[PDB]
Subunit: 198 residues, 2 copies
């Protein structure tokens, strides 16, 4: 007779529906749990959502932290081969991760942040050049996983750029931190794929 439970279906469902490729079963188990809770307690899901939106500051402090942390895996992802193309891949990767990771501490000042975007674009570029320079060291009929990972990276670099544009109208910084983290993860995936096939 009222719409007190709309947020269960309008927010929490889509939230669980859209996390299904991450972990199908947990999405299922948590939807079920909210539905049960909301059935007993009309209005509860709404209250929970509102308490989450109120911790925005915490959650942005945390996402900043995650992004700063994303800068440094040294032991796992790293190609073994001393070849210049492969070694150049490591250092161009590292430099991109480092620059992306420092976004939280440059974003609040327009000027130094304009320099950072340029540095980033420069780094993404320098990474692509090194990704393309290394293609030749893999049998040309055995590059399917390499070329596909390259596309993924570009897509996420497109997404990141499209995320910048939106930041200059919104002002909503988390979108940047989130997208830059995903980009960091994609350059990690480049390294994994590139080391694995070699």
């Amino acid at each position: 007779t009222s719409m007190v439970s709309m947020p269960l279906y309008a927010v929490m469902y889509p939230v669980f529906n859209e996390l299904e490729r991450v972990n199908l079963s947990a999405a299922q188990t948590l939807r079920a749990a909210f539905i049960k809770a909301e059935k007993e307690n009309p209005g509860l899901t709404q209250d929970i959502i509102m308490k989450i939106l109120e911790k925005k500051s915490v959650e942005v402090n945390f996402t900043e932290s995650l992004l700063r942390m994303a800068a440094d895996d040294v032991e796992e992802y790293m190609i073994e081969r001393p070849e210049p193309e492969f070694q150049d891949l490591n250092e161009k990767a590292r430099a991109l991760k480092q620059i992306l990771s420092k976004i939280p501490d440059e974003i609040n000042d327009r000027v130094r942040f304009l320099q950072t975007i340029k540095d980033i674009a420069s780094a993404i570029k320098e990474l692509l050049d090194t990704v393309n320079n290394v293609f030749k060291k893999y049998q040309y009929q055995n590059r399917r996983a390499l070329e596909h990972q390259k596309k993924e990276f570009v897509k996420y670099s497109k997404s990141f750029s499209d995320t910048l544009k939106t930041y200059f109208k919104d002002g909503k910084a988390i979108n940047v931190f989130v997208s830059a983290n995903r980009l960091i993860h994609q350059t990690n995936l480049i390294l994994q794929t590139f080391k694995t096939v070699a």
Copy 2:
């Protein structure tokens, strides 16, 4: 130890979800215990889950902005809801002053964006609140041959939320975020309603 086993990515389970369940516990232990256990288990198997859930909730903020604004505008239909069907000047006053507060609060979405007319709106809300309160304390002293350990609570409860509304205005001029204002205005409409209910008993 526990702090060292648990991934850094699991942090928003403890920084954000646990406080939510701790507050819910006071009002529904079962729901809280159950929702906590589901999060605990899901987080344990897929570290980072809670983080992803929260980010997706934050991304859907506009759905919540729309929903809260909606509830506020729809409250214009229920402005004459909860009138006390007692016919004496104290109660005629308490009905009209409560009706006028609900009417003005539900007008907020229309004024909020034009900041000039919003400053003019703030004064009237405070003026309507004060004129509700001034009417309350009269019916409080006249009709109190019965319940004190409930009516004292409600008068307190109204003041608590009313100054929390006023508080949200200043945070809004600091913020630019309407949802906080819509939310508190909705709450104050509810408190007003609770007042009309408490005096009916």
